[PDB]
Design a protein around this ligand. Structure first.
Ligand SMILES: *[C@@H]1O[C@H](CO)[C@@H](O[C@@H]2O[C@H](CO)[C@@H](O[C@@H]3O[C@H](CO)[C@@H](O)[C@H](O[C@H]4O[C@H](CO)[C@@H](O)[C@H](O)[C@@H]4O[C@H]4O[C@H](CO)[C@@H](O)[C@H](O)[C@@H]4O)[C@@H]3O)[C@H](O)[C@H]2NC(C)=O)[C@H](O)[C@H]1NC(C)=O
Ligand SMILES: *[C@@H]1O[C@H](CO)[C@@H](O[C@@H]2O[C@H](CO)[C@@H](O[C@@H]3O[C@H](CO[C@H]4O[C@H](CO)[C@@H](O)[C@H](O)[C@@H]4O)[C@@H](O)[C@H](O[C@H]4O[C@H](CO)[C@@H](O)[C@H](O)[C@@H]4O)[C@@H]3O)[C@H](O)[C@H]2NC(C)=O)[C@H](O)[C@H]1NC(C)=O
Ligand SMILES: *[C@@H]1O[C@H](CO)[C@@H](O[C@@H]2O[C@H](CO)[C@@H](O[C@@H]3O[C@H](CO)[C@@H](O)[C@H](O[C@H]4O[C@H](CO)[C@@H](O)[C@H](O)[C@@H]4O)[C@@H]3O)[C@H](O)[C@H]2NC(C)=O)[C@H](O)[C@H]1NC(C)=O
Ligand SMILES: *[C@@H]1O[C@H](CO)[C@@H](O[C@@H]2O[C@H](CO)[C@@H](O[C@@H]3O[C@H](CO)[C@@H](O)[C@H](O[C@H]4O[C@H](CO)[C@@H](O)[C@H](O)[C@@H]4O)[C@@H]3O)[C@H](O)[C@H]2NC(C)=O)[C@H](O)[C@H]1NC(C)=O
Ligand SMILES: *[C@@H]1O[C@H](CO)[C@@H](O[C@@H]2O[C@H](CO)[C@@H](O[C@@H]3O[C@H](CO)[C@@H](O)[C@H](O)[C@@H]3O)[C@H](O)[C@H]2NC(C)=O)[C@H](O)[C@H]1NC(C)=O
Ligand SMILES: *[C@@H]1O[C@H](CO)[C@@H](O[C@@H]2O[C@H](CO)[C@@H](O[C@@H]3O[C@H](CO)[C@@H](O)[C@H](O)[C@@H]3O)[C@H](O)[C@H]2NC(C)=O)[C@H](O)[C@H]1NC(C)=O
Ligand SMILES: *[C@@H]1O[C@H](CO[C@@H]2O[C@@H](C)[C@@H](O)[C@@H](O)[C@@H]2O)[C@@H](O[C@@H]2O[C@H](CO)[C@@H](O)[C@H](O)[C@H]2NC(C)=O)[C@H](O)[C@H]1NC(C)=O
Ligand SMILES: *[C@@H]1O[C@H](CO)[C@@H](O[C@@H]2O[C@H](CO)[C@@H](O)[C@H](O)[C@H]2NC(C)=O)[C@H](O)[C@H]1NC(C)=O
Ligand SMILES: *[C@@H]1O[C@H](CO)[C@@H](O[C@@H]2O[C@H](CO)[C@@H](O)[C@H](O)[C@H]2NC(C)=O)[C@H](O)[C@H]1NC(C)=O
Ligand SMILES: *[C@@H]1O[C@H](CO)[C@@H](O[C@@H]2O[C@H](CO)[C@@H](O)[C@H](O)[C@H]2NC(C)=O)[C@H](O)[C@H]1NC(C)=O
Ligand SMILES: *[C@@H]1O[C@H](CO)[C@@H](O[C@@H]2O[C@H](CO)[C@@H](O)[C@H](O)[C@H]2NC(C)=O)[C@H](O)[C@H]1NC(C)=O
Ligand SMILES: *[C@@H]1O[C@H](CO)[C@@H](O[C@@H]2O[C@H](CO)[C@@H](O)[C@H](O)[C@H]2NC(C)=O)[C@H](O)[C@H]1NC(C)=O
Ligand SMILES: *[C@@H]1O[C@H](CO)[C@@H](O)[C@H](O)[C@H]1NC(C)=O
Ligand SMILES: *[C@@H]1O[C@H](CO)[C@@H](O)[C@H](O)[C@H]1NC(C)=O
Ligand SMILES: *[C@@H]1O[C@H](CO)[C@@H](O)[C@H](O)[C@H]1NC(C)=O
Ligand SMILES: *[C@@H]1O[C@H](CO)[C@@H](O)[C@H](O)[C@H]1NC(C)=O
Ligand SMILES: *[C@@H]1O[C@H](CO)[C@@H](O)[C@H](O)[C@H]1NC(C)=O
Ligand SMILES: *[C@@H]1O[C@H](CO)[C@@H](O)[C@H](O)[C@H]1NC(C)=O
Ligand SMILES: *[C@@H]1O[C@H](CO)[C@@H](O)[C@H](O)[C@H]1NC(C)=O
Lengths: 188, 153, 218, 212, 181, 145, 152
């Protein structure tokens, strides 16, 4: 196709990260509003950005959920790493959950630069490394001032389905946040 | 990282690595020579090498272990397999709107007759679009110029 | 100092061929990629061709140039060459050679530019001009100097006596390959009657001197 | 034709801040963030004033700044100085070619009030038509800043072929003047009803029409 | 000046860390009692060691301060990493009323050591002037001052004893949350 | 390790240095920065380059940015090393002063090693003279090849 | 890690009879220990930095010392090298428990290689046969070093 020095031919290759589904989670993107983190070939996690809210509570009962191991510890770990990676997290009233019956669901109210809405989108942008840029309109050239039009960021548990249309899955997203965990929080 | 990768039972030479048809998307299996993959243990600045250790660890963990879902295992070997700061570099490049590597596509120089290939470097992406061959042509030139020197030794 | 210098510009017949050079001074020639950018004397810059660093394996051309120009380089000789063939009259421009590096990690822009070399394409020979009058609280009148070659022509009004309001425009190279210009003067409308206006076109290369009296329209 | 659309001219008083827009397609300016701006003084070669949209080479005054929004890049020159009066070009990476350049913009430091052009359209001479030739001379004079864009019409129909225009040359009064020509056959001359010359200067257009 | 092997001449260079003020914080020292961490060219933080106390409270209201984002998140971050870096923390009083952040620490192997231990690394520039028995002592570093107060201040050229440098703050980022009960 | 990538040589401007003019270093010198992991001067170059690069490519409202690239720019354990030397009262590097060998005629310089300090006083040339000797002896071997 | 450790030559290291079990003191050449600063994947080098730091802390400080090590751990040893051996043990591969090492000592010259770890599988050290080819590449590399030195 294209030769260099007359003898060397330029060739390419594209890796299929879907193989790693058993050992590590894989993050991909469907459309502007929906993003996913697949942990296995059965269970998974859905990252959605919608103006429509699901949880009306203002309190997140974790201790009650921790007693009843109905949830999946794998999915509960990858959502635990997310919250710790959020920088400069101070107000907890914007965070609401609902772990009744094992169904894990967390909602972040983004209606409240250098705000709590940025930190959530900042961690979310790294988590869905595949196609996060489609979500933010002012992504390029903005770090602390990233913003959206959506009001809520909901994370729910879902079953595996072939919906990685916009971007192929990859673990690099989740891998990066493991080091960032518990490194930008204030004192309680 | 400290993971040592090696293809046991590999026919051609010891130390090389082959990517199966399942490891690649819409492509057949591809093998790489010892001279190329040897740089993976030496250098710390290659994204493709980090993927090989992930694919090898994923393969190694599957055949040698009993799955119960096995998330704790990776959460401990992360730093021993990939270069965490190499992920940070690409994120900084994306934040500054520099062409960055999303770890999917790679490019290498394959000899038409000899068959010796270079270590595939990552194909950078800008605005969800891979760079044209022209925009990093001089990167291929230094690779082709380095391909000669390595064979000379 | 880091420099780049061109050579080979000149007059060439329509359909002929010309060879340009570009020499480096004060930097490692091999590492960088080189380009050719021509600038029409009265218009903006246009990219023509490009050559990759080290071995010139990656070559690019402009659609308006493809098939007619051929770029080459010699790292040891520190010379960048561009071969022109089937030159059209519209190829007349100031050709520059600039450097840059096409790297995904450490790219370099078109930082270093040469002084440029002027290339003129015209198959016409030495021909005299054809002066026509541009008949008119003030009115404008002038003379049209059309289809002459080569440059230049000098225009005066009333044998240098009239200077107020006179303006001679620069020449224009037409598609035929012959220059043309105009020289006008704005004078009071009342003076059109009493005053006599004569332009004195002089084309020394053809040993021609024409004097045309501009009279108002009948 | 220039790949990137640049304005004819932008002007400002000394000490002001002016901006030049470099509009391109989605395949060039929008695709990559490698946009470069060049300053070319009369007789000299283009000098790289800004590369990579907003990065400034060492030795370039901090008054020059770069911007980009979608398919349009913007070069802003704050604190205008007389030394800044020159022609400015823009370039970008492209999917089809390595570099694509713009038409170019002339930045004038307003040292005198803006002057509208004085258009004078001349019909073909009687001696010229007797030589089986016909040229329409459009005379643009006494305008400031020195940059215009002419357009020809034939019965309100735009004409492009056979049009040659000069660059604005300075007059004795420090004002500028330009000339445009429309060469055509005598058959074309008497064919159409009227021929027009549209001269656009700083957003305001002056038009003169002649008939056989 | 001084040649080696006859051809090689020994030369030196001193970096001006003041350039990095925009990207990272810079720690310097004025005198024995006053130390500073300047974030940018306008705001900053002052580390003072005095027998005179400022805060008389026994409680540090963090939840109330987090509700009102009057404070600067940058200064609140470099003060949060400080408290997290303190080893074996099991005496801390604050006052964040109206955005003005102010923390006071009431002073072997005690809580007074950990605070001075973190402080010594924090003001990497010229912290050694504060401690009298610093050299040769790690767990037994002590002073005569009774209180360590950290307040918000505006930038002023008061880096007399030691030049500013970020190396201090950078070192504590890894040590954070690694020695708590 | 670190991964920040800083043709290939580096120059320190008059603003980057204190009471000194701009100084440039050759490719062969700075090339050791990517190879070795225990050089303080290289960590400063990546800090000055990251600070320079971030300024021109970004719009300041910027503390969160550095808090993520720290490990990707400098060697954290290299800071710990100097702290241990200070705690044990060994001459340590406070990252301010450096020394290098400049060829009087050629102009080739070594990678500037840190000038250690003990009790707020920089060491005399005599107290680390043998360090300069091994550097000059190594400078020859590089110049030979 | 960044710790720089340091009789016959400066830069070499000797392990006293108290540092070893049922053995006399052993010294290693400069060429061997220089690889410790170069390579990042050698267990023996991590132990040298531990023994040197332990020695350095004792003589240069006054014990009241767990906080000290809790800060220099990453600056002395390669933490991921410990993780490597744990992964090998978890997969029942022969791993290094950091106790025993093996090296090639010249009968006449006395130059030794950098001692590589003696792997163990199910609480039993591997026989010389089961890693003989590892010694071969070590002996082949030892020759190249002798040529590289005498060639210069
Ligand atoms: C790194 O960056 C690059 C560039 O930005 C990213 O590349 C893009 O990746 C996406 C995702 O694959 C890709 O989108 C595809 O376009 C194809 C057409 O060109 C589509 O055919 C394809 O859809 C199929 O796959 C989806 C995912 O599996 C399915 O959900 C979908 O239904 C399609 O499936 C086909 O096959 C089934 C089975 O037969 C059938 O039932 C269906 O009807 C259908 O026929 C994707 O939409 C882009 O084209 C890529 N862009 C480029 C420039 O290459 C890359 O993802 C990035 N890497 C990471 C890790 O983020
Ligand atoms: C650099 O470039 C070179 C040359 O372009 C590449 O080399 C070629 O690599 C391919 C793939 O590895 C080789 O193709 C394969 O040969 C295998 C062995 O061949 C047997 O079968 C043939 C049949 O005629 C017998 O003659 C022979 O004796 C062997 O018994 C096959 O098993 C492979 O087949 C599989 O794929 C095909 C589709 O391609 C299926 O239809 C089959 O069913 C089967 O699944 C395949 O045909 C090829 O021979 C190599 N050529 C040379 C000259 O070396 C390098 O791979 C490339 N480097 C990189 C890194 O890409
Ligand atoms: C690394 O160690 C060295 C040595 O211990 C250390 O150097 C010292 O830095 C200080 C701070 O600059 C120097 O003190 C100065 O002395 C000069 C006279 O020689 C004065 O003019 C200086 O005052 C001016 O600057 C002040 C700060 O801007 C102003 O407030 C003042 O008004 C003056 O304008 C200043 O007092 C000292 O001389 C050196 N010592 C040596 C031996 O060089 C260095 O700071 C350490 N690095 C770090 C990052 O801490
Ligand atoms: C903050 O408050 C503390 C506590 O009040 C204060 O510390 C005290 O400092 C004094 C003076 O340095 C110490 O007094 C000394 O005690 C030692 C024994 O511990 C004596 O040997 C000393 O005596 C010599 O010096 C005297 C003159 O000061 C001579 O008269 C005498 O003959 C000896 O030569 C001296 O009495 C005192 O012990 C400490 N207190 C504590 C609890 O450590 C500190 O100075 C205050 N700081 C400020 C800035 O105000
Ligand atoms: C999650 O990862 C596993 C393992 O990487 C994926 O499983 C793999 O699936 C492919 C296709 O079904 C298997 O390929 C097959 O190979 C056999 C020879 O052994 C051959 O008869 C066929 O070619 C067959 O398709 C592959 O063996 C299998 N790997 C393992 C270890 O079981 C799985 O598909 C991934 N999940 C998702 C949702 O992609
Ligand atoms: C915080 O950091 C910034 C950036 O590193 C420092 O700003 C810099 O200040 C100097 C001196 O004012 C500027 O130098 C100047 O260069 C221009 C040419 O561009 C020339 O006309 C003069 O020599 C002029 O002094 C430098 O450009 C500027 N850098 C930037 C990026 O703006 C600032 O001083 C630091 N803060 C403190 C308190 O030191
Ligand atoms: C510049 O690249 C485009 C597109 O590149 C293709 O897509 C990239 C994401 C990457 O995967 C490349 O390897 C691909 O080749 C080229 O346009 C394509 O040209 C090929 C061959 O002519 C054709 O098969 C595709 O359909 C084209 N796709 C599109 C979207 O146009 C283009 O030719 C390249 N330009 C140059 C000068 O090399
Ligand atoms: C992105 O894709 C998803 C899935 O195709 C869309 O999801 C659903 O939205 C519609 C309309 O609101 C509902 O009727 C469905 O019940 C939703 N399904 C699920 C599983 O939630 C989503 O609307 C798309 N978003 C965009 C912006 O295109
Ligand atoms: C979610 O709600 C917000 C706020 O109502 C919507 O944002 C507005 O978008 C319109 C059109 O672009 C603007 O004119 C308004 O100024 C925006 N409001 C604000 C507060 O910025 C947003 O479009 C909604 N998103 C969806 C998917 O419905
Ligand atoms: C260190 O310097 C500071 C500032 O120069 C000194 O602080 C001042 O001390 C005087 C006398 O107590 C007060 O009147 C001022 O109000 C103080 N200024 C501030 C900003 O607090 C301080 O005393 C010096 N300390 C030493 C030990 O020299
Ligand atoms: C090494 O020494 C040479 C000579 O003293 C230095 O070169 C001079 O540099 C200055 C400033 O850049 C120039 O004005 C002179 O013209 C140079 N002279 C020569 C002979 O080259 C060089 O800068 C020194 N190297 C370093 C790193 O400081
Ligand atoms: C390599 O072998 C030599 C010879 O067996 C060892 O050298 C002897 O060391 C002991 C104890 O240090 C001395 O008492 C002998 O005098 C030495 N003999 C000779 C001939 O040198 C040497 O110690 C061995 N190297 C190692 C690392 O164990
Ligand atoms: C997931 O994979 C396992 C093992 O390969 C298999 O037994 C199971 O049926 C798969 N589940 C689905 C939903 O494909
Ligand atoms: C989440 O898990 C709960 C409990 O296992 C289940 O009832 C619910 O259907 C799951 N969510 C989805 C979207 O399937
Ligand atoms: C989110 O916050 C806004 C503003 O405080 C409030 O009006 C809205 O009710 C909140 N939504 C939820 C679900 O808490
Ligand atoms: C990428 O560039 C295109 C070019 O116009 C722009 O429309 C788009 O918004 C940019 N970003 C994304 C996420 O597509
Ligand atoms: C801080 O720096 C900015 C930009 O250099 C400048 O505009 C501002 O005046 C400075 N503030 C002070 C207090 O010097
Ligand atoms: C500090 O502690 C001492 C001893 O417990 C006590 O006497 C003193 O009042 C305390 N000071 C403050 C400000 O709490
Ligand atoms: C600290 O901040 C508060 C509120 O911004 C301000 O009132 C106070 O003056 C600041 N402290 C100093 C010393 O300026």
């Amino acid at each position: 196709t294209s030769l260099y020095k007359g003898v060397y031919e330029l060739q390419t290759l594209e890796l299929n990260m879907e193989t790693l589904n058993m050992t590590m989670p894989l993050s991909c993107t469907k459309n502007n509003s929906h993003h996913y983190i697949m942990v296995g070939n059965e269970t998974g996690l859905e990252l959605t950005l919608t103006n429509t809210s699901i949880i009306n509570h203002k309190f997140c009962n974790l201790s009650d959920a921790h007693k009843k191991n109905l949830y999946d510890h794998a999915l509960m770990s990858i959502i635990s790493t997310f919250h710790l990676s959020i920088p400069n997290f101070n107000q907890y009233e914007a965070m609401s959950c609902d772990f009744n019956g094992g169904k894990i669901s967390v909602q972040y109210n983004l209606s409240h630069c250098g705000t709590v809405a940025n930190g959530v989108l900042q961690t979310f942008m790294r988590m869905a490394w595949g196609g996060s840029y489609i979500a933010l309109d002012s992504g390029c050239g903005n770090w602390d001032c990233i913003m959206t039009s959506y009001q809520y960021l909901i994370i729910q548990n879902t079953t595996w389905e072939d919906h990685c249309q916009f971007s192929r899955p990859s673990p690099i997203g989740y891998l990066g946040l493991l080091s960032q965990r518990t490194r930008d929080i204030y004192i309680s | 990282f400290t993971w040592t990768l090696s293809d046991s039972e590999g026919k051609d030479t010891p130390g090389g690595y082959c990517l199966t048809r399942w490891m690649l998307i819409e492509a057949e299996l591809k093998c790489f020579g010892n001279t190329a993959v040897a740089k993976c243990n030496e250098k710390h600045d290659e994204e493709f090498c980090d993927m090989l250790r992930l694919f090898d660890f994923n393969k190694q963990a599957i055949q040698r272990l009993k799955a119960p879902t096995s998330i704790q295992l990776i959460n401990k070997a992360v730093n021993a397999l990939i270069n965490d700061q190499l992920i940070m570099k690409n994120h900084l490049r994306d934040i500054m709107c520099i062409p960055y590597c999303n770890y999917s596509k790679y490019w290498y120089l394959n000899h038409t007759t000899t068959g010796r290939t270079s270590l595939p470097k990552c194909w950078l992406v800008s605005n969800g679009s891979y760079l044209n061959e022209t925009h990093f042509s001089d990167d291929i030139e230094q690779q082709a110029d380095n391909m000669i020197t390595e064979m000379l030794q | 100092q880091v420099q780049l210098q061109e050579s080979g510009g000149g007059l060439v017949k329509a359909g002929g061929s010309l060879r340009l050079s570009c020499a480096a001074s004060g930097f490692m020639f091999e590492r960088y990629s080189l380009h050719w950018v021509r600038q029409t004397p009265g218009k903006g810059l246009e990219w023509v061709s490009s050559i990759s660093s080290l071995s010139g394996s990656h070559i690019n051309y402009a659609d308006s140039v493809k098939g007619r120009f051929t770029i080459s380089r010699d790292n040891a000789k520190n010379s960048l060459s561009l071969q022109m063939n089937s030159l059209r009259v519209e190829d007349t421009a100031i050709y520059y050679c600039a450097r840059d590096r096409r790297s995904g990690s450490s790219p370099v822009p078109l930082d270093v530019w040469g002084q440029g070399t002027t290339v003129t394409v015209s198959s016409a020979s030495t021909k005299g001009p054809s002066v026509f009058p541009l008949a008119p609280g003030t009115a404008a009148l002038g003379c049209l100097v059309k289809d002459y070659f080569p440059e230049p022509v000098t225009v005066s009004w009333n044998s240098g006596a009239l200077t107020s309001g006179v303006h001679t425009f620069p020449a224009v190279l037409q598609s035929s390959g012959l220059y043309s210009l105009s020289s006008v003067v704005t004078v009071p409308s009342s003076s059109l009657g009493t005053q006599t206006y004569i332009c004195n076109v002089n084309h020394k290369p053809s040993n021609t001197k024409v004097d045309k009296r501009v009279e108002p329209k009948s | 034709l220039p790949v990137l659309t640049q304005p004819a001219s932008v002007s400002g008083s000394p000490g002001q801040s002016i901006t030049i827009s470099c509009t391109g397609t989605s395949s060039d300016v929008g695709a990559y963030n490698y946009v470069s701006w060049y300053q070319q003084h009369p007789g000299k070669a283009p000098k790289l004033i800004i590369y990579e949209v907003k990065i400034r080479p060492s030795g370039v005054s901090n008054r020059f700044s770069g911007s980009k929004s979608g398919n349009t890049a913007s070069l802003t020159i704050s604190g205008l100085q007389a030394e800044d009066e020159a022609d400015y070009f823009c370039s970008s990476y492209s999917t089809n070619s390595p570099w694509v350049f713009g038409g170019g913009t002339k930045v004038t430091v307003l040292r005198q009030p803006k002057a509208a052009p004085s258009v004078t359209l001349f019909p073909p001479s009687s001696e010229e038509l007797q030589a089986n030739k016909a040229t329409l001379v459009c005379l643009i004079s006494d305008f400031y800043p020195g940059a215009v864009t002419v357009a020809w019409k034939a019965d309100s129909s735009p004409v492009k072929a056979g049009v040659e225009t000069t660059t604005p040359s300075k007059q004795s009064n420090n004002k500028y003047a330009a000339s445009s020509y429309l060469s055509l056959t005598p058959e074309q001359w008497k064919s159409h009803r009227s021929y027009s010359c549209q001269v656009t200067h700083e957003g305001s257009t002056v038009e003169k029409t002649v008939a056989p």
